[PDB]
Amino acid sequence: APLNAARPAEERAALLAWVKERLHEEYGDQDPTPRRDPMHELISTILSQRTTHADEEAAYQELRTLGDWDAITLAPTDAVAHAIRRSNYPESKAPRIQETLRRIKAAPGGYDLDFLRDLPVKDALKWLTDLPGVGVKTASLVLLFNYARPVFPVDTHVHRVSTRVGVIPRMGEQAAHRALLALLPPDPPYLYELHINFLSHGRQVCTWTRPKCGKCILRERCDAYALYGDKVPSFS
Ligand code: SF4
Ligand SMILES: [Mg+2]
Ligand SMILES: [Mg+2]
User: Which parts are annotated binding residues for [4Fe-4S] cluster?
Assistant: First the structure.
């Protein structure tokens, strides 16, 4: 009885489809994601590095007391750094923020990302990942949620559950974006549902340490449980 992670890609694709339907039954349309507008998501992402969620939100709102995006680009960089002093390493984040705001404005439209809607997906991804402090996960999240493009964001919860089950073998988070999207239909609502139900599952059941496999609807087809039973180790 071979592990899932060794099976042909067409079999691991069918497995991920079975996972998708079981997780939909458990969580329906619960949505734990912040669901921000694009500009807010990008800047929050930059602020979030090595920073708690509470610290991130406070730093963002404090940033916005400096004014609209125009004033923030024009503000002295020391003034920005002081505004975001609740987040970690404010001095290094202050200019990544201004850089990104400057590049956004220069693009067609104002402080808007609506031009991305009409670009080829690969090009749209690249434009976003080129932005300072923006990774492939946030780039994918913005494109899927805000502009309904067929890309699939892989956060720590999606990575952990899909690797434990054995949909993919062990690999880095960025490579897992390529690998998991290759197993999925180009269907944005389908991708969104799968993303958020993974989030709910990783938070409530398939946790970082001591997962609750006895309460898990995926148990009978999970590689990690087959290997370790009740003693699945912590994910890394
Ligand atoms: S059986 Fe355990 S390790 Fe496997 S997906 Fe469920 S909670 Fe995670
Ligand atoms: Mg613009
Ligand atoms: Mg980048």
Answer: 206, 213, 216, 222
Ligand at shortest distance from the CA of 210? 1
- Find the DSSP H helices in 28-130: 38-47, 53-64, 69-74, 77-83, 90-106, 121-129
**Is residue 120 located within the same domain as residue 184?**
no
Residue 126 shares a structural domain with residue 26: no
Residues 177 and 218 in one domain: yes
Buried b (16+ CB within 10 A) or exposed e, 38-69: bbebbbbbbbbeebeeebbbbbbebbeebeeb
Q: Which amino acid is at 165?
A: V
What token pair was written down for 84?
């975001």
- Please state the domain count of the chain: 2
90, 8: one domain: no
- State the resolution, in angstroms: 2.2
Tell me the technique behind this structure: X-ray
